[PDB]
Design a protein around this ligand. Structure first.
Ligand SMILES: COc1cccc2c1cc(C(=O)O)c1c(C(=O)O)cc3c(c12)OCO3
Ligand SMILES: COc1cccc2c1cc(C(=O)O)c1c(C(=O)O)cc3c(c12)OCO3
Ligand SMILES: O=P(O)(O)OC[C@H]1O[C@H](OP(=O)(O)OP(=O)(O)O)[C@H](O)[C@@H]1O
Ligand SMILES: [Mg+2]
Ligand SMILES: [Mg+2]
Length: 346
């Protein structure tokens, strides 16, 4: 296999042969690819229309190189709440806030995350500003998960070999298939997730990757563009269970949610977004709480889907009760405090 062969096949608008995407990602991850080759590959794959098989190969290589968590430290029902980013909206950190709430409801959360790429403050940035340790290695993440109920896998800590691809990703500015890989490469490999995708035309492919792994995942794209379940309008959900993908449209109005405006969800710097987390966890009502509860509920629905018995509407009703209760009882607020204390005590 070679760069001219793979790039030629992609530029000819052909799906790659089995193993080719994997070979390429492996070249990229082993420092053997020129930035020009990485960029050509990312761009060519994106414009060809990536297949689930191809993206799966990419994510598989990354996982094969990632730092794993210690044996038997991640429960079978752990969940992730993470998105591609790239929605261009600069919101409050909805996935991060939802993840705290989900963990406080008693669902084990191992969240994959990163700093901002285009937004003013990404999940990792806001967590850091809240006093949460984002730098923990495999052993200490496993401990955070066991002791606090949530661990955060900072992508750079667990995927050091991806630095070459990351550089190119940042240099070229344009979203590509690489923008899908974060949510697909949680090194703890949780089997459930609420997974945001900013790119409507790539969400189905993301869902196919999770389907191949037999994860229970809702891949979500707000019809306003959010890489989250939105409250401003409907969201498209690619529902993954039992190895197949179902496309659904989701309407919060069905659950008594009032329509919000996008600017009601707007974010600021790390300090402002940290303040927004504190506000929601302290019981402040309004648009941000609503979107947090909705997304927390969706992650709980993904978790419910790990069972073959799971029913969609009962799961949403239970997810919503559980997310609201986790905030209202103070569990979410306390969990954050305990998470901060945990990190200060290593
Ligand atoms: C130094 O910057 C980094 C170090 C290690 C990893 C990553 C990284 C940057 C990005 C990124 O550019 O956002 C990134 C992304 C992404 O969303 O592109 C996805 C990933 C990553 C990384 O590893 C897991 O899957
Ligand atoms: C928590 O409840 C769930 C979580 C995740 C997925 C599903 C789900 C429930 C149902 C369901 O309505 O029994 C469901 C159905 C269905 O049987 O209509 C079909 C699917 C699904 C799901 O994902 C792939 O295609
Ligand atoms: O700068 P952007 O490309 O727009 O990305 C914004 C954040 O979105 C993704 O994280 P994540 O979904 O984990 O959560 P946060 O905003 O939602 O809570 C990404 O890793 C960034 O941290
Ligand atoms: Mg998000
Ligand atoms: Mg977002």
């Amino acid at each position: 296999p070679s760069w001219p062969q793979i790039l030629g096949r992609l530029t000819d608008n052909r799906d790659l042969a089995r193993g080719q995407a994997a070979w390429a990602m492996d070249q990229i991850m082993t420092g053997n690819a020129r930035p020009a080759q990485i960029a050509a590959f990312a761009v060519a794959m994106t414009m060809k229309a990536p297949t689930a098989d191809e993206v799966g190969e990419l994510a598989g290589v990354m996982l094969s190189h990632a730092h794993p968590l210690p044996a038997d430290t991640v429960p079978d029902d752990a969940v992730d709440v993470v998105g591609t980013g790239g929605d261009g909206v600069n919101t409050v950190n909805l996935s991060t806030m939802a993840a705290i709430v989900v963990a406080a409801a008693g669902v084990p959360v191992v969240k994959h995350g990163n700093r901002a790429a285009s937004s003013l403050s990404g999940g990792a940035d806001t967590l850091e500003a809240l006093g949460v340790r984002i730098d923990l290695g495999p052993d200490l993440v496993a401990r955070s998960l066991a002791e606090v109920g949530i661990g955060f896998c900072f992508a750079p800590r667990f995927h050091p070999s991806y630095r070459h691809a990351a550089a190119v990703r940042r240099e070229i500015g344009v979203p590509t298939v690489f923008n899908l890989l974060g949510p697909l490469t949680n090194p703890a490999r949780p089997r459930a997730g609420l997974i945001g995708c900013a790119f409507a035309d790539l969400a189905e492919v993301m869902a196919g990757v999770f389907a191949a792994r037999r994860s229970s995942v809702l891949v979500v794209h707000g019809d306003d563009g959010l890489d989250e379940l939105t409250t401003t309008t409907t969201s498209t959900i690619w529902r993954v269970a039992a190895g197949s993908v179902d496309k659904l449209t989701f309407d919060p109005a069905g659950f008594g949610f009032a329509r919000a405006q996008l600017d009601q969800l707007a974010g600021g710097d790390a300090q402002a977004n940290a303040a927004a987390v504190r506000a929601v966890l302290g019981g402040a009502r309004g648009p941000v709480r609503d979107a947090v509860v909705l997304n927390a509920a969706g992650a709980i629905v993904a978790h419910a889907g790990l069972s073959s018995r799971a029913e969609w509407l009962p799961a949403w009703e239970e997810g919503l009760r559980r997310a609201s209760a986790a905030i209202d009882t103070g569990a979410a607020e306390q969990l954050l405090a305990r998470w901060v204390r945990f990190g200060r005590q290593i």
